[PDB]
């Protein structure tokens, strides 16, 4: 079970809209987006009684 | 006398689900929850598969397959022993494999022990060990007790104040499995799969410390059977099926609208091959060899829960 | 340390976790005669990241 | 002897089974005679089987 | 006699097992400036490991 998102338009969607807060003008920047699986690959099922 | 048992289990999803579901980030129409049923689906083939497995993995476990109200998946509460008559279902060990007394002694002797057992089980043609299916780290427990070790030395001939100085205890455990499979016979097999339990702990599913042991032959121990359930009226008459169903409910249109799947099956596995002149069943055994495996084990990652 | 360079100031990067759901359970037991239980329910979760 | 053995310099300690399986050979062979095994046996009035 | 602290190869040994499950953290090489032999010439348990 998933969660119904969109990893794209997610990701696109926390980049700062406005937030012109440091310098008092918008600097020049440069974004690289990346998404990451988090299982747990330790719990395998039981395949040995199947067999016997 | 045999008689299997039942199961069954059921969905629902109201009308504020099925109409309002959308996508968490992108802006699209109502049909999310058609790609959710599916999942419900598959997740209920799955199961019941896992009832399959559990059922089978408890007799060849405990013998016996025991259901109370105790139980995590059991709303019902049915209690149930259904005792399936293996005779001897553990082994005994008072002190065990990994025991040492004393400076570096230990107390009792694997390959004997199963030497007298296949010699004690000789005119019991059908309780004379074959296999051996253990999961872990076996290997160290074979390579640290003291006869197993002065049998790896006697075969190589290391003598540690003549031959060669002292060899580690890798050499050691990287041999001692074929010694071992060379002087008694018992092809032993590995298997270790591992089920993350309510603990955050990974346990193997041949628990750390014990092997189970084959009577004799590698074989079918009996056959899981399934038994009909109900599929109604074909022509005009009841006309059954055999295999886990699983069904979907229509209730679209009723007040509420609503939707429910239900899956479930009959089914409980069977001993085929007894004994006859007695009553006896001894196919496969269980023995717990030593307490501290862990240890001898790399450690396990958490869970993360992010 | 190999050399790159960028005409662009300021380097961030955006993670994005995903833990989807692993089907656990068991089906639930009943005699013949009963009506159905349903089953609980459980959860999948996304984090995201800034550098 | 008959093997070349020595508890402190060829091997550490020969199991039972290498004793058992050259014991009957070095008998025959020292003794001279003939071993004519005979395994065949009876029940007893008690249930007991006795050769 | 010269006993010495800590085996370096089991100790190198135990941090690769110990992250046998933990693969980004599990070591391949090593740089090493000076001379080094002179510290495992001068080390007990490497000693009997040569012999």
Same mark, same amino acid.
């Given at each position: 079970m998933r969660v119904p998102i969109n990893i794209n338009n997610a990701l696109a969607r926390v980049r700062d809209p406005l937030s012109i807060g440091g310098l008092k003008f918008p600097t020049t920047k440069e974004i690289q987006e990346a998404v990451a699986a988090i299982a747990d690959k330790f719990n395998q099922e039981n395949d040995l009684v199947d067999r016997f | 006398?045999?008689?299997?048992?039942?199961?069954?289990?059921?969905?629902?999803?109201?009308?504020?689900?099925?109409?309002?579901?959308?996508?968490?980030?992108?802006?699209?129409?109502?049909?999310?929850?058609?790609?959710?049923?599916?999942?419900?689906?598959?997740?209920?083939?799955?199961?019941?598969?896992?009832?399959?497995?559990?059922?089978?993995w408890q007799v060849m476990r405990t013998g016996r397959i025991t259901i109370q109200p105790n139980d995590p998946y059991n709303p019902n509460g049915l209690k149930y022993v259904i005792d399936y008559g293996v005779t001897d279902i553990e082994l005994p060990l008072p002190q065990k494999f990994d025991?040492?007394?004393?400076?570096?002694?230990?107390?009792?002797?694997?390959?004997?022990?199963?030497?007298?057992?296949?010699?004690?089980?000789?005119?019991?043609?059908?309780?004379?060990?074959?296999?051996?299916?253990?999961?872990?780290?076996?290997?160290?427990?074979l390579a640290d007790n003291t006869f197993v070790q002065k049998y790896v030395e006697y075969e190589k001939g290391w003598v540690v104040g003549?031959?060669?100085?002292?060899?580690?205890?890798?050499?050691?455990?990287?041999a001692a499995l074929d010694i071992f499979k060379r002087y008694t016979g018992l092809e032993v097999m590995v298997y270790d799969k591992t089920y993350r339990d309510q603990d955050g702990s990974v346990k193997y599913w041949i628990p750390v410390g014990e092997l189970i042991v084959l009577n004799q032959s590698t074989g079918p121990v009996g056959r899981f059977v399934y038994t009909a359930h109900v599929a109604g009226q074909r022509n005009g008459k009841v006309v059954y099926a055999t295999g886990p169903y699983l069904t979907v409910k229509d209730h679209l249109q009723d007040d509420p609208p609503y939707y429910a799947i239900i899956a479930g099956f009959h089914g409980l596995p069977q001993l085929s091959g007894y004994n006859t002149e007695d009553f006896s069943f001894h196919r496969f055994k269980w023995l717990k060899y030593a307490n501290n495996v862990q240890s001898y084990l790399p450690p396990f990652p958490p869970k993360v829960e992010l | 340390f190999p050399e790159d360079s960028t005409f662009a100031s300021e380097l961030e990067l955006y993670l994005l976790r995903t833990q989807d759901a692993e089907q656990t359970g068991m089906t639930f037991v009943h005699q013949v005669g009963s009506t159905s239980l349903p089953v609980?329910?459980?959860? &999948? /979760?996304?984090?995201? &990241? /800034?550098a």
């Open positions: - | 006398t045999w008689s299997p048992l039942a199961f069954k289990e059921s969905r629902v999803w109201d009308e504020k689900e099925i109409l309002y579901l959308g996508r968490l980030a992108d802006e699209v129409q109502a049909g999310v929850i058609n790609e959710q049923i599916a999942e419900s689906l598959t997740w209920l083939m799955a199961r019941m598969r896992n009832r399959r497995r559990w059922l089978t025991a040492k007394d004393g400076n570096g002694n230990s107390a009792v002797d694997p390959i004997q022990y199963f030497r007298d057992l296949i010699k004690a089980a000789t005119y019991f043609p059908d309780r004379r060990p074959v296999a051996i299916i253990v999961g872990p780290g076996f290997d160290e427990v003549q031959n060669t100085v002292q060899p580690p205890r890798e050499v050691y455990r990287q | 609980e329910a459980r959860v &999948a /979760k996304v984090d995201l &990241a /800034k």
